[PDB]
Design a protein around this ligand. Structure first.
Ligand SMILES: Nc1nc2c(ncn2[C@H]2C[C@H](O)[C@@H](COP(=O)(O)OP(=O)(O)OP(=O)(O)O)O2)c(=O)[nH]1
Ligand SMILES: Nc1nc2c(ncn2[C@H]2C[C@H](O)[C@@H](COP(=O)(O)OP(=O)(O)OP(=O)(O)O)O2)c(=O)[nH]1
Lengths: 129, 132
């Protein structure tokens, strides 16, 4: 039993966009579940819109990973988001931040992201140091 | 309700590896890229190295992720991750598929392949370093 998730990398002068989960406390890349019928891209442009209020174009696929929370299995696809209309506003996360990507190392993020943090860094054109 | 599937591109002087689905009580006749379902617990890579071993008898290293697509059977949801397989040990033997072939990638245009593959045949060609 799987739940496919899509997530995007938006950048701003090097910094990356994470959002703070509402109802949990963790920071994460904007995105959400693929609904029945939609391509990953469609799901992501939609989630970016309803979470951020932006009209995003979905770029290259960067990474995929899996994670288990019990009998629950998530598959996350991460996509580079270069192009969008407007500026992201917090519609769903009780906070949004542009952070230095190095900060991920000491932000509370999904264990699914934590375990592949290095892969994420490369995908962002960076070095795990 | 979703089913993540992983699949590989192996290449041989330009040609690409496809296998023919077992002429059996399965969704057969169709040619497809070697691979299979992600089992519980495994990363996409683990699932694919494993599937390439059971289907082909090769020890493959899984390379860079090229493509992801989805497809519906109304109620059934298939998500397919395609990976570049550059390195492996041995030569592929027909173990699961009732036929294996190295084909000119162009031949995909007139091969019976999963609709999930045909809908994005153009994306596949690019991911293979070619032009549609
Ligand atoms: N968007 C996003 N989701 C992630 C990330 N890492 C792990 N996930 C997982 C946690 C969640 O189970 C799932 C995202 O589901 P959502 O919270 O967007 O759906 P929703 O708010 O509707 O929750 P619900 O189905 O009502 O319980 O993906 C990430 O970096 N970004
Ligand atoms: N490996 C691979 N699977 C594909 C491709 N296109 C669509 N699929 C879908 C169809 C199948 O539902 C799924 C692969 O499942 P498997 O054949 O590995 O499972 P199994 O051998 O147990 O047979 P079964 O699906 O239970 O009838 O992926 C492709 O190009 N390569």
């Amino acid at each position: 039993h799987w739940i496919p998730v899509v997530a995007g990398f938006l950048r701003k002068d090097g910094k990356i966009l994470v959002g703070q989960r509402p109802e949990a406390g963790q920071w994460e890349f904007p995105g959400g579940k693929i609904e029945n019928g939609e391509t990953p891209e469609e799901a992501l442009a939609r989630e970016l819109n309803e979470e951020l209020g932006i009209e995003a174009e979905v770029g290259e696929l960067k990474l995929a990973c899996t994670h288990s929370y019990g009998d629950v299995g998530i598959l996350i696809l991460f996509y580079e988001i270069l192009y969008w209309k407007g500026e992201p506003r917090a519609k769903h996360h009780m906070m949004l931040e542009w952070i230095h990507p190095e900060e991920l190392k000491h932000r509370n993020i999904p264990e699914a992201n934590r375990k592949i943090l290095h892969k994420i860094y490369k995908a962002l054109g960076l070095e795990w140091r």
